[PDB]
Amino acid sequence: QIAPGQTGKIADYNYKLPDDFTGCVIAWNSNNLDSKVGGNYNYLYRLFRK
Amino acid sequence: GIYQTSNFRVQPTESIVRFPNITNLCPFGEVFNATRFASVYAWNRKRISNCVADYSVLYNSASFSTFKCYGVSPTKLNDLCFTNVYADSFVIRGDEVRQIAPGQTGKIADYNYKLPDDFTGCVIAWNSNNLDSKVGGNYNYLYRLFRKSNLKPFERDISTEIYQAGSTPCNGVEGFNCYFPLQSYGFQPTNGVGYQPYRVVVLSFELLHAPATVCGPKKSTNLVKNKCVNFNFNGLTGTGVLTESNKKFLPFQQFGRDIADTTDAVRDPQTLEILDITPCSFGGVSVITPGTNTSNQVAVLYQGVNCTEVNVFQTRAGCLIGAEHVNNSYECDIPIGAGICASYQTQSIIAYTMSLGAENSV
Amino acid sequence: QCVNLTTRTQLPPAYTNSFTRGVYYPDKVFRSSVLHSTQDLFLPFFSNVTWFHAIHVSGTNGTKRFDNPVLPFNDGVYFASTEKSNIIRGWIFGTTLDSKTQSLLIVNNATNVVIKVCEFQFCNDPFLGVYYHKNNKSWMESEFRVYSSANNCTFEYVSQPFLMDLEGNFKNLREFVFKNIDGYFKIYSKHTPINLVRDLPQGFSALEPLVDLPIGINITRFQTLLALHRSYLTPGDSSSGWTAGAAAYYVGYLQPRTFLLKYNENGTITDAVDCALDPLSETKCTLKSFTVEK
Amino acid sequence: QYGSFCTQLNRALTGIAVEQDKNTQEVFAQVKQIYKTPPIKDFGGFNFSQILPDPSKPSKRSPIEDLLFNKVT
Amino acid sequence: VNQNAQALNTLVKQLSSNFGAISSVLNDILSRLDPPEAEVQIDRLITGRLQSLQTYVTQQLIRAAEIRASANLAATKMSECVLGQSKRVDFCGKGYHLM
Amino acid sequence: VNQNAQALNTLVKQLSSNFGAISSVLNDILSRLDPPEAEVQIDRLITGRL
Ligand SMILES: *[C@@H]1O[C@H](CO)[C@@H](O[C@@H]2O[C@H](CO)[C@@H](O)[C@H](O)[C@H]2NC(C)=O)[C@H](O)[C@H]1NC(C)=O
Ligand SMILES: *[C@@H]1O[C@H](CO)[C@@H](O)[C@H](O)[C@H]1NC(C)=O
Ligand SMILES: *[C@@H]1O[C@H](CO)[C@@H](O)[C@H](O)[C@H]1NC(C)=O
Ligand SMILES: *[C@@H]1O[C@H](CO)[C@@H](O)[C@H](O)[C@H]1NC(C)=O
Ligand SMILES: *[C@@H]1O[C@H](CO)[C@@H](O)[C@H](O)[C@H]1NC(C)=O
Numbered sequence: 005q006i007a008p009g010q011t012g013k014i015a016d017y018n019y020k021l022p023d024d025f026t027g028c029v030i031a032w033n034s035n036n037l038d039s040k041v042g043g044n045y046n047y048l049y050r051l052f053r054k
Numbered sequence: 055g056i057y058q059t060s061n062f063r064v065q066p067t068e069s070i071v072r073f074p075n076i077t078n079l080c081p082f083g084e085v086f087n088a089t090r091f092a093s094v095y096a097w098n099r100k101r102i103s104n105c106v107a108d109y110s111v112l113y114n115s116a117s118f119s120t121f122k123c124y125g126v127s128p129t130k131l132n133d134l135c136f137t138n139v140y141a142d143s144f145v146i147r148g149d150e151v152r153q154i155a156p157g158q159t160g161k162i163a164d165y166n167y168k169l170p171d172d173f174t175g176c177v178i179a180w181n182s183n184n185l186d187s188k189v190g191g192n193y194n195y196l197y198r199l200f201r202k203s204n205l206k207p208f209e210r211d212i213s214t215e216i217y218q219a220g221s222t223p224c225n226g227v228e229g230f231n232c233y234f235p236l237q238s239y240g241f242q243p244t245n246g247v248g249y250q251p252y253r254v255v256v257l258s259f260e261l262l263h264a265p266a267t268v269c270g271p272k273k274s275t276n277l278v279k280n281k282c283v284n285f286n287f288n289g290l291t292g293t294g295v296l297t298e299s300n301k302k303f304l305p306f307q308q309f310g311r312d313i314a315d316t317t318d319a320v321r322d323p324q325t326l327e328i329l330d331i332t333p334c335s336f337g338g339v340s341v342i343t344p345g346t347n348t349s350n351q352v353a354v355l356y357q358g359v360n361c362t363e364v365n366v367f368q369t370r371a372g373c374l375i376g377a378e379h380v381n382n383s384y385e386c387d388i389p390i391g392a393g394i395c396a397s398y399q400t401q402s403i404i405a406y407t408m409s410l411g412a413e414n415s416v
Numbered sequence: 417q418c419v420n421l422t423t424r425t426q427l428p429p430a431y432t433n434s435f436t437r438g439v440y441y442p443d444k445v446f447r448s449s450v451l452h453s454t455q456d457l458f459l460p461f462f463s464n465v466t467w468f469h470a471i472h473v474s475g476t477n478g479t480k481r482f483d484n485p486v487l488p489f490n491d492g493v494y495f496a497s498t499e500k501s502n503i504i505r506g507w508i509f510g511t512t513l514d515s516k517t518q519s520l521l522i523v524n525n526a527t528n529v530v531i532k533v534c535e536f537q538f539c540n541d542p543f544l545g546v547y548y549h550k551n552n553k554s555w556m557e558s559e560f561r562v563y564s565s566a567n568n569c570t571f572e573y574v575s576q577p578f579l580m581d582l583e584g585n586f587k588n589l590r591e592f593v594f595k596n597i598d599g600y601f602k603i604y605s606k607h608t609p610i611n612l613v614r615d616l617p618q619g620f621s622a623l624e625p626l627v628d629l630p631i632g633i634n635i636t637r638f639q640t641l642l643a644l645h646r647s648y649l650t651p652g653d654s655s656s657g658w659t660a661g662a663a664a665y666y667v668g669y670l671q672p673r674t675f676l677l678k679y680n681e682n683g684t685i686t687d688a689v690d691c692a693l694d695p696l697s698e699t700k701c702t703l704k705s706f707t708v709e710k
Numbered sequence: 711q712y713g714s715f716c717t718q719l720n721r722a723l724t725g726i727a728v729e730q731d732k733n734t735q736e737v738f739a740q741v742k743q744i745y746k747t748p749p750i751k752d753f754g755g756f757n758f759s760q761i762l763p764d765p766s767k768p769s770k771r772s773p774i775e776d777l778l779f780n781k782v783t
Numbered sequence: 784v785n786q787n788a789q790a791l792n793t794l795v796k797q798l799s800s801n802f803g804a805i806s807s808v809l810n811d812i813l814s815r816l817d818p819p820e821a822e823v824q825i826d827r828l829i830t831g832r833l834q835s836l837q838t839y840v841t842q843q844l845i846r847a848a849e850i851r852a853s854a855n856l857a858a859t860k861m862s863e864c865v866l867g868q869s870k871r872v873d874f875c876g877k878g879y880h881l882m
Numbered sequence: 883v884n885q886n887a888q889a890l891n892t893l894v895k896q897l898s899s900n901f902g903a904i905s906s907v908l909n910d911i912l913s914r915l916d917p918p919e920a921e922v923q924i925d926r927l928i929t930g931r932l
């Protein structure tokens with residue numbers, strides 16, 4: 005959903021890429037860096053928006 | 055001279071909507087949440103009619119692995135009206151879910167379930183590893199691996215005739231080169247994601263020119279007449295003026311087309327009165343001017359429109375504003391049309407009937 | 417329960433001509449003073465339609481027997497009937513017509529219609545034994561002997577009778593068109609009072625769409641159901657039945673054709689041109705006119 | 711995104727429309743004076759009544775011109 | 784009268800062509816799709832309709848050239864046959880031109 | 883003179899039209915994109931200019 009021309013939860017409520025988007029999306033695994041044994045609830049995620 | 059500068063395009067007001075009065079609720083729990091999900095070789099198909107659909111609830115669930123609409127956008131499903139809906143439900147594994155799409159090939163695509171290449175509708179799919187899986191194996195879902203020929207779109211023929219892949223038929227006996235057409239699959243809670251069960255519901259929309267039975271949750275505002283409005287009749291959107299019609303639409307006729315590409319009349323569903331749709335207005339806009347090297351005054355010709363839709367002179371070429379009509383006749387200076395010409399004389403713009411020449415009796 | 421009738425005797429077929437008949441409204445869109453070309457399943461002009469009597473007297477004895485032979489249903493059917501005593505009552509449609517596969521029933525009694533879709537175990541001789549009452553005889557009582565059993569019905573439709581009441585030569589023609597497309601059984605219908613014409617009339621009359629049942633069933637064959645006036649207990653020597661079957665019914669088959677329909681200002685299809693009929697009709701269709709200059 | 715195609719098309723159509731009036735003016739405006747025939751039509755026996763304007767008729771036309779305007783749809 | 788009418792009729796009929804799009808009606812495309820795919824369909828419609836308009840204008844230009852030639856001939860005949868007596872054989876009529 | 887000059891000016895100005903491509907400049911498309919997508923853009927430019 006970080007690709008232009010897409011409609012989705014993130015694409016509608018958190019991050020919306022333009023249709024005429026010029027640029028690069030880069031993603032890499034970060035469980036060794038952010039995930040915790042007891043649970044890492046430090047990153048939020050938006051569900052509801054008018 | 056006279057220059058075509060713009061085109062005046064009288065605008066709409068107070069957009070009206072005339073959806074049917076139907077106030078039912080769709081069966082999105084007895085088909086979409088059925089305890090029994092049939093196999094793909096015999097997919098469960100239900101016809102949906104006469105009910106009011108709210109696709110916002112279904113689309114906004116975040117419980118789906120796949121939600122692909124073709125010919126329509128999921129967000130705009132709420133504004134549309136359909137003559138009928140079809141709901142086809144089955145269960146397949148993940149690696150084959152990609153074959154539920156127009157123009158897709160494969161085992162299930164050409165042997166179990168084939169969507170048409172002209173598909174209009176939405177495919178919804180979610181994982182059911184917690185419902186269809188069995189610890190010992192659920193072999194109750196049957197797919198077809200061999201067939202005489204591929205499927206036409208929307209084909210369901212249940213057959214158990216074992217097909218002969220060798221040089222001699224076995225005549226219904228399971229033997230050499232005569233395999234059993236129906237293959238079962240070993241669903242497990244420990245199965246890989248590509249092999250875990252997914253329940254799939256495909257919604258096919260009959261976008262015909264028929265009285266819409268399935269519609270979105272829209273409100274029908276009061277009808278407005280002799281006015282330029284944005285109208286939405288049964289999901290059909292447009293912009294124009296609705297007027298009394300003496301046309302005789304027989305009880306089966308819904309729309310009206312004397313141009314064959316634009317609905318010039320329409321039957322309102324609430325009140326079965328039939329109203330004709332004539333567009334609001336349009337026409338060229340011409341600026342009559344002398345040289346700016348002489349003056350900055352201009353006159354405006356609204357071509358082919360009466361002097362109500364817009365020093366007001368109704369000529370056969372349209373409405374003239376900013377020029378005074380004079381009784382005298384002169385040679386044409388700026389041609390307006392239909393024998394009318396314009397000039398700039400002491401200092402105002404005059405409009406007159408052109409003179410063909412001096413009279414002369416021999 | 418139904419009663420077995422005498423042998424069909426395998427009557428030799430007879431044919432007649434369709435003089436520009438079977439045109440219907442191909443859409444639900446209004447058009448006026450236009451010439452519109454539509455590609456659809458139409459009955460081709462001047463086609464050979466097979467006609468069967470209501471009652472036929474073929475034996476020298478004076479035998480009056482029903483003529484309700486079984487016919488196939490491929491790509492739609494045109495069904496006309498000329499009658500003056502309402503000896504026609506309805507139809508059955510299906511493929512096997514037994515307890516195996518479901519089938520459609522349309523019947524029209526003196527009150528309303530009955531349209532069902534289930535696995536009727538039709539017997540070889542379905543009809544309606546008809547009689548009047550001894551005091552009023554204004555309307556006609558019927559006892560249907562169509563099927564032995566009916567189970568697993570998922571449809572039911574009742575509306576105004578398809579056939580009006582026809583109660584000396586006040587014969588009238590009744591035209592129907594049946595199409596099974598997209599699970600839709602579309603019936604188009606029309607009625608015409610006729611004078612002094614036994615056969616199909618030469619003329620034009622478009623069939624207004626009568627109904628569109630979303631049955632979603634499979635049709636390859638059909639039958640026709642009639643009303644029995646005489647007694648199967650005691651077959652009369654003569655005149656007990658409906659005048660040895662003067663009334664009759666004609667069957668033709670639809671084909672994929674491109675037609676040019678002429679809509680008047682009132683929206684009525686007054687005439688049509690069958691493009692693939694002959695070179696003159698092809699010229700009319702390419703010029704989109706009914707008259708052709710030299 | 712297609713640029714000036716629509717403007718080109720409008721310019722060409724406007725040129726054609728102007729050329730039509732130019733054609734009519736070149737054909738028919740070939741006289742400076744509006745001449746009229748004498749009230750008495752004595753031309754030595756020659757009779758021009760079928761090509762001369764018919765005054766007892768609106769939109770003054772000759773009988774031949776009236777037929778011509780009636781025979782073109 | 785006929786040819787031009789024919790041309791105009793043809794042009795109007797070209798508005799019923801989808802040109803590969805899901806529909807020939809712009810409002811139906813915009814009522815069903817979001818901008819990304821709606822623009823894809825609208826571009827096909829635009830290509831088809833622009834080609835139709837260009838074809839119409841080209842035929843109109845050629846026909847106008849022919850009509851201009853006819854009008855020039857008419858003006859020449861007005862000058863030489865009506866305003867004078869022509870010695871050009873068959874230019875005005877058949878026979879020796881009087882008037 | 884004016885007709886020919888205006889026609890040539892219109893032909894020249896048509897070169898600034900994208901015709902649906904990401905840019906009306908061929909060199910920019912070549913410098914920004916790899917051949918598979920550059921061809922897609924150049925085809926739109928070619929169609930418009932032809
Ligand atoms: C010139 O010709 C016209 C006919 O073209 C003559 O008009 C006719 O006049 C007589 C009476 O004299 C009428 O009975 C006819 O009906 C007229 N015919 C038409 C067609 O109108 C006219 O009289 C002639 N002029 C002269 C001076 O003889
Ligand atoms: C639909 O409901 C409205 C509001 O009660 C009513 O006026 C209208 O007649 C209804 N439609 C039909 C076909 O009865
Ligand atoms: C189907 O049932 C599940 C659980 O019972 C529920 O979460 C879901 O909302 C239901 N579907 C719909 C469309 O309500
Ligand atoms: C304009 O409208 C008036 C309203 O009465 C009418 O009389 C007149 O004929 C109209 N003119 C044209 C050119 O339609
Ligand atoms: C022309 O003169 C008449 C009287 O002869 C008058 O009624 C009319 O208004 C005049 N026209 C203009 C445009 O002044």
Ligand SMILES: *[C@@H]1O[C@H](CO)[C@@H](O)[C@H](O)[C@H]1NC(C)=O
Pocket residue numbers: 511512634635636
């Ligand atoms: C319809 O029935 C006929 C005869 O029983 C059969 O041959 C045909 O395959 C059937 N078609 C469908 C779609 O059921």
